[PDB]
Amino acid sequence: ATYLIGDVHGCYDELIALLHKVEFTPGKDTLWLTGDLVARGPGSLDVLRYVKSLGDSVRLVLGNHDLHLLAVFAGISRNKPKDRLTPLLEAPDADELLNWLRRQPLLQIDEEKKLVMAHAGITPQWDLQTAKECARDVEAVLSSDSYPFFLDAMYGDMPNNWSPELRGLGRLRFITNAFTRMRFCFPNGQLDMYSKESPEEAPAPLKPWFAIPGPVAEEYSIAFGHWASLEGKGTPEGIYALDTGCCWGGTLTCLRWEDKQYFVQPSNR
Ligand SMILES: [Mn+2]
Numbered sequence: 001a002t003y004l005i006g007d008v009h010g011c012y013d014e015l016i017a018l019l020h021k022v023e024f025t026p027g028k029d030t031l032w033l034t035g036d037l038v039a040r041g042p043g044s045l046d047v048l049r050y051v052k053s054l055g056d057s058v059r060l061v062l063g064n065h066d067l068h069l070l071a072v073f074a075g076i077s078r079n080k081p082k083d084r085l086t087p088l089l090e091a092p093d094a095d096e097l098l099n100w101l102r103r104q105p106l107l108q109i110d111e112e113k114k115l116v117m118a119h120a121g122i123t124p125q126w127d128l129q130t131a132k133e134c135a136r137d138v139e140a141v142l143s144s145d146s147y148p149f150f151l152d153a154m155y156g157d158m159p160n161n162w163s164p165e166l167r168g169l170g171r172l173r174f175i176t177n178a179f180t181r182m183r184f185c186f187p188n189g190q191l192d193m194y195s196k197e198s199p200e201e202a203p204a205p206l207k208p209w210f211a212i213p214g215p216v217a218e219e220y221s222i223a224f225g226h227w228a229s230l231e232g233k234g235t236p237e238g239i240y241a242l243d244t245g246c247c248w249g250g251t252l253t254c255l256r257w258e259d260k261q262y263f264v265q266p267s268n269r
Protein backbone atom coordinates (compact mmCIF):
# COMPACT_ATOMS: atom_id res chain seq x y z
CA ALA A 1 0.00 0.00 0.00
CA THR A 2 0.94 3.66 -0.50
CA TYR A 3 0.67 6.04 2.44
CA LEU A 4 1.14 9.82 2.37
CA ILE A 5 1.61 11.78 5.61
CA GLY A 6 1.82 15.55 6.05
CA ASP A 7 4.23 17.70 8.07
CA VAL A 8 5.60 15.69 11.00
CA HIS A 9 7.45 18.64 12.66
CA GLY A 10 9.24 16.46 15.15
CA CYS A 11 6.08 14.69 16.33
CA TYR A 12 7.73 11.27 16.43
CA ASP A 13 5.18 9.67 18.81
CA GLU A 14 2.22 10.63 16.62
CA LEU A 15 4.05 9.49 13.49
CA ILE A 16 4.74 6.01 14.87
CA ALA A 17 1.22 5.72 16.30
CA LEU A 18 -0.34 6.61 12.93
CA LEU A 19 1.91 4.17 11.08
CA HIS A 20 0.98 1.43 13.56
CA LYS A 21 -2.69 2.30 12.97
CA VAL A 22 -2.33 1.46 9.26
CA GLU A 23 0.18 -1.36 9.99
CA PHE A 24 2.78 0.24 7.74
CA THR A 25 5.10 -2.56 6.60
CA PRO A 26 8.29 -1.63 4.70
CA GLY A 27 8.72 -4.01 1.79
CA LYS A 28 4.98 -4.22 1.15
CA ASP A 29 4.14 -0.53 1.68
CA THR A 30 5.67 2.81 0.69
CA LEU A 31 5.49 6.07 2.65
CA TRP A 32 5.43 9.55 1.08
CA LEU A 33 6.31 12.42 3.46
CA THR A 34 5.56 16.06 2.54
CA GLY A 35 8.66 17.45 4.29
CA ASP A 36 9.03 19.59 7.40
CA LEU A 37 10.17 16.52 9.28
CA VAL A 38 11.80 18.64 11.97
CA ALA A 39 11.29 21.68 14.25
CA ARG A 40 8.75 22.74 16.92
CA GLY A 41 7.84 19.17 17.88
CA PRO A 42 10.10 17.54 20.49
CA GLY A 43 11.34 14.58 18.45
CA SER A 44 13.22 15.90 15.40
CA LEU A 45 16.23 13.64 16.11
CA ASP A 46 14.10 10.49 16.34
CA VAL A 47 12.08 11.44 13.25
CA LEU A 48 15.19 11.86 11.09
CA ARG A 49 16.71 8.63 12.41
CA TYR A 50 13.57 6.66 11.54
CA VAL A 51 12.84 8.19 8.11
CA LYS A 52 16.47 7.73 7.04
CA SER A 53 16.31 4.08 8.15
CA LEU A 54 13.35 3.47 5.81
CA GLY A 55 15.48 3.77 2.69
CA ASP A 56 13.58 2.96 -0.48
CA SER A 57 10.37 2.45 1.57
CA VAL A 58 10.03 6.23 1.94
CA ARG A 59 9.76 9.01 -0.67
CA LEU A 60 10.51 12.39 0.95
CA VAL A 61 10.47 15.97 -0.30
CA LEU A 62 12.32 18.68 1.64
CA GLY A 63 10.33 21.51 3.22
CA ASN A 64 11.30 24.96 4.45
CA HIS A 65 12.04 23.78 7.99
CA ASP A 66 14.28 21.01 6.68
CA LEU A 67 16.22 23.59 4.71
CA HIS A 68 16.36 25.89 7.73
CA LEU A 69 17.77 23.04 9.85
CA LEU A 70 20.45 22.55 7.21
CA ALA A 71 21.24 26.28 7.25
CA VAL A 72 21.64 26.17 11.06
CA PHE A 73 23.80 23.04 10.85
CA ALA A 74 26.07 24.74 8.29
CA GLY A 75 26.49 27.89 10.41
CA ILE A 76 24.50 29.94 7.92
CA SER A 77 21.52 30.82 10.13
CA ARG A 78 20.85 31.28 13.83
CA ASN A 79 19.10 28.59 15.87
CA LYS A 80 15.73 29.65 17.29
CA PRO A 81 14.95 28.15 20.72
CA LYS A 82 11.35 27.50 19.66
CA ASP A 83 12.41 25.10 16.87
CA ARG A 84 13.78 22.61 19.45
CA LEU A 85 16.59 21.49 17.11
CA THR A 86 19.41 21.30 19.68
CA PRO A 87 19.20 17.55 20.49
CA LEU A 88 19.45 16.81 16.76
CA LEU A 89 22.24 19.35 16.14
CA GLU A 90 24.26 17.92 19.08
CA ALA A 91 23.70 14.25 18.24
CA PRO A 92 26.80 12.15 17.49
CA ASP A 93 25.15 11.07 14.23
CA ALA A 94 24.14 14.62 13.23
CA ASP A 95 26.57 14.55 10.29
CA GLU A 96 25.19 11.27 8.94
CA LEU A 97 21.59 12.44 9.33
CA LEU A 98 21.94 15.91 7.83
CA ASN A 99 24.20 14.84 4.95
CA TRP A 100 21.49 12.32 4.13
CA LEU A 101 18.77 14.95 4.49
CA ARG A 102 20.34 17.41 2.08
CA ARG A 103 20.47 14.71 -0.62
CA GLN A 104 16.69 14.20 -0.69
CA PRO A 105 14.45 15.43 -3.50
CA LEU A 106 12.33 18.53 -3.62
CA LEU A 107 9.90 16.78 -5.97
CA GLN A 108 8.50 13.24 -6.20
CA ILE A 109 6.66 11.88 -9.28
CA ASP A 110 4.96 8.50 -9.70
CA GLU A 111 3.77 8.22 -13.31
CA GLU A 112 1.70 5.07 -12.77
CA LYS A 113 -0.29 6.80 -10.02
CA LYS A 114 -0.21 10.12 -11.89
CA LEU A 115 0.84 11.60 -8.57
CA VAL A 116 3.16 14.53 -7.87
CA MET A 117 4.43 15.62 -4.47
CA ALA A 118 6.24 18.75 -3.32
CA HIS A 119 6.29 20.50 0.03
CA ALA A 120 4.25 23.57 -0.91
CA GLY A 121 2.78 22.24 -4.17
CA ILE A 122 3.45 23.15 -7.82
CA THR A 123 3.19 26.74 -8.99
CA PRO A 124 0.71 27.08 -11.87
CA GLN A 125 3.55 28.79 -13.81
CA TRP A 126 5.44 25.48 -14.21
CA ASP A 127 4.75 22.56 -16.49
CA LEU A 128 6.06 19.19 -15.40
CA GLN A 129 9.27 19.39 -17.45
CA THR A 130 10.12 22.75 -15.88
CA ALA A 131 9.32 21.59 -12.34
CA LYS A 132 11.61 18.59 -12.85
CA GLU A 133 14.49 20.69 -14.17
CA CYS A 134 14.10 23.16 -11.33
CA ALA A 135 14.08 20.42 -8.69
CA ARG A 136 17.14 18.86 -10.29
CA ASP A 137 19.03 22.17 -10.25
CA VAL A 138 18.41 22.90 -6.57
CA GLU A 139 18.94 19.28 -5.52
CA ALA A 140 22.33 19.37 -7.27
CA VAL A 141 23.42 22.39 -5.25
CA LEU A 142 22.06 20.96 -1.99
CA SER A 143 23.90 17.68 -2.52
CA SER A 144 27.19 19.36 -3.47
CA ASP A 145 30.17 20.09 -1.22
CA SER A 146 29.25 23.76 -1.61
CA TYR A 147 25.73 23.53 -0.21
CA PRO A 148 26.24 26.24 2.50
CA PHE A 149 26.70 28.93 -0.16
CA PHE A 150 23.38 27.95 -1.71
CA LEU A 151 21.67 27.87 1.67
CA ASP A 152 22.92 31.40 2.31
CA ALA A 153 21.76 32.47 -1.14
CA MET A 154 18.29 30.98 -0.73
CA TYR A 155 16.95 33.53 1.75
CA GLY A 156 14.85 36.21 0.05
CA ASP A 157 11.37 36.94 -1.27
CA MET A 158 12.20 38.04 -4.85
CA PRO A 159 11.79 37.40 -7.72
CA ASN A 160 8.24 36.08 -7.35
CA ASN A 161 7.49 35.56 -11.04
CA TRP A 162 8.84 32.65 -13.06
CA SER A 163 10.49 33.06 -16.43
CA PRO A 164 12.75 30.64 -18.33
CA GLU A 165 15.16 33.62 -18.56
CA LEU A 166 15.77 33.86 -14.81
CA ARG A 167 19.45 33.35 -14.08
CA GLY A 168 21.68 32.99 -11.10
CA LEU A 169 20.67 33.83 -7.55
CA GLY A 170 17.14 34.96 -8.42
CA ARG A 171 16.47 31.73 -10.29
CA LEU A 172 17.46 29.53 -7.34
CA ARG A 173 15.59 31.72 -4.86
CA PHE A 174 12.37 31.54 -6.89
CA ILE A 175 12.66 27.77 -7.26
CA THR A 176 13.20 27.35 -3.51
CA ASN A 177 10.30 29.64 -2.63
CA ALA A 178 7.97 27.91 -5.13
CA PHE A 179 8.69 24.41 -3.77
CA THR A 180 8.88 25.13 -0.04
CA ARG A 181 7.17 28.46 0.79
CA MET A 182 4.31 28.96 -1.74
CA ARG A 183 0.74 29.47 -0.55
CA PHE A 184 -1.03 32.36 -2.33
CA CYS A 185 -0.73 33.49 -5.93
CA PHE A 186 -1.74 36.60 -7.80
CA PRO A 187 -4.06 35.96 -10.77
CA ASN A 188 -1.05 35.82 -13.12
CA GLY A 189 0.45 32.99 -11.01
CA GLN A 190 2.92 35.35 -9.32
CA LEU A 191 3.93 34.19 -5.82
CA ASP A 192 2.93 36.14 -2.71
CA MET A 193 5.43 35.58 0.10
CA TYR A 194 3.64 37.26 3.04
CA SER A 195 0.11 35.96 3.59
CA LYS A 196 0.02 32.75 5.68
CA GLU A 197 -3.68 32.68 6.62
CA SER A 198 -6.54 30.48 5.46
CA PRO A 199 -7.97 31.23 1.99
CA GLU A 200 -11.08 32.78 3.62
CA GLU A 201 -8.97 35.48 5.33
CA ALA A 202 -6.77 36.16 2.33
CA PRO A 203 -6.91 39.67 0.83
CA ALA A 204 -7.99 40.06 -2.76
CA PRO A 205 -6.84 39.31 -5.35
CA LEU A 206 -4.85 36.53 -3.62
CA LYS A 207 -5.97 32.98 -4.43
CA PRO A 208 -4.51 29.60 -3.39
CA TRP A 209 -1.93 28.35 -5.86
CA PHE A 210 -4.24 25.38 -6.48
CA ALA A 211 -7.16 27.67 -7.44
CA ILE A 212 -5.25 28.74 -10.58
CA PRO A 213 -5.32 26.26 -13.50
CA GLY A 214 -1.83 25.00 -14.24
CA PRO A 215 -0.59 22.28 -16.58
CA VAL A 216 0.70 19.95 -13.85
CA ALA A 217 -2.47 20.02 -11.75
CA GLU A 218 -4.56 19.42 -14.90
CA GLU A 219 -2.80 16.11 -15.62
CA TYR A 220 -1.60 14.97 -12.18
CA SER A 221 -2.83 14.74 -8.64
CA ILE A 222 -0.70 16.89 -6.33
CA ALA A 223 -0.04 16.11 -2.66
CA PHE A 224 1.63 18.70 -0.46
CA GLY A 225 1.99 19.77 3.15
CA HIS A 226 3.23 23.14 4.48
CA TRP A 227 0.00 25.18 4.54
CA ALA A 228 -1.28 24.41 8.03
CA SER A 229 -3.93 27.15 8.14
CA LEU A 230 -5.64 25.28 5.29
CA GLU A 231 -6.35 22.52 7.84
CA GLY A 232 -6.43 20.09 4.92
CA LYS A 233 -9.75 21.49 3.65
CA GLY A 234 -11.02 23.51 0.71
CA THR A 235 -9.03 21.92 -2.08
CA PRO A 236 -10.32 20.92 -5.53
CA GLU A 237 -10.45 17.40 -6.91
CA GLY A 238 -6.99 15.91 -7.20
CA ILE A 239 -5.36 18.34 -4.72
CA TYR A 240 -4.46 16.77 -1.35
CA ALA A 241 -3.46 19.21 1.39
CA LEU A 242 -1.94 16.89 3.99
CA ASP A 243 -0.65 19.30 6.68
CA THR A 244 -3.27 19.33 9.45
CA GLY A 245 -0.90 20.98 11.93
CA CYS A 246 0.11 18.20 14.29
CA CYS A 247 2.92 20.17 15.95
CA TRP A 248 0.34 22.93 16.57
CA GLY A 249 -2.06 20.71 18.51
CA GLY A 250 -3.89 19.75 15.33
CA THR A 251 -3.59 16.25 13.87
CA LEU A 252 -1.21 14.15 11.83
CA THR A 253 -3.02 13.01 8.70
CA CYS A 254 -2.31 9.89 6.65
CA LEU A 255 -3.89 9.20 3.24
CA ARG A 256 -3.83 5.70 1.73
CA TRP A 257 -3.57 6.18 -2.03
CA GLU A 258 -5.23 2.97 -3.24
CA ASP A 259 -8.64 3.67 -1.68
CA LYS A 260 -8.24 7.37 -0.77
CA GLN A 261 -8.85 6.40 2.85
CA TYR A 262 -7.82 8.91 5.53
CA PHE A 263 -6.40 7.98 8.94
CA VAL A 264 -5.87 10.63 11.62
CA GLN A 265 -3.70 10.74 14.75
CA PRO A 266 -4.49 13.35 17.42
CA SER A 267 -1.77 15.64 18.69
CA ASN A 268 -0.42 14.39 22.02
CA ARG A 269 0.76 17.93 22.87
MN1 LIG B 1 6.36 24.31 5.48
Ligand SMILES: [Mn+2]
Binds near residue numbers: 036065227
Ligand atom coordinates in the same frame (compact mmCIF):
# COMPACT_ATOMS: atom_id res chain seq x y z
MN1 LIG C 1 5.19 22.88 8.18
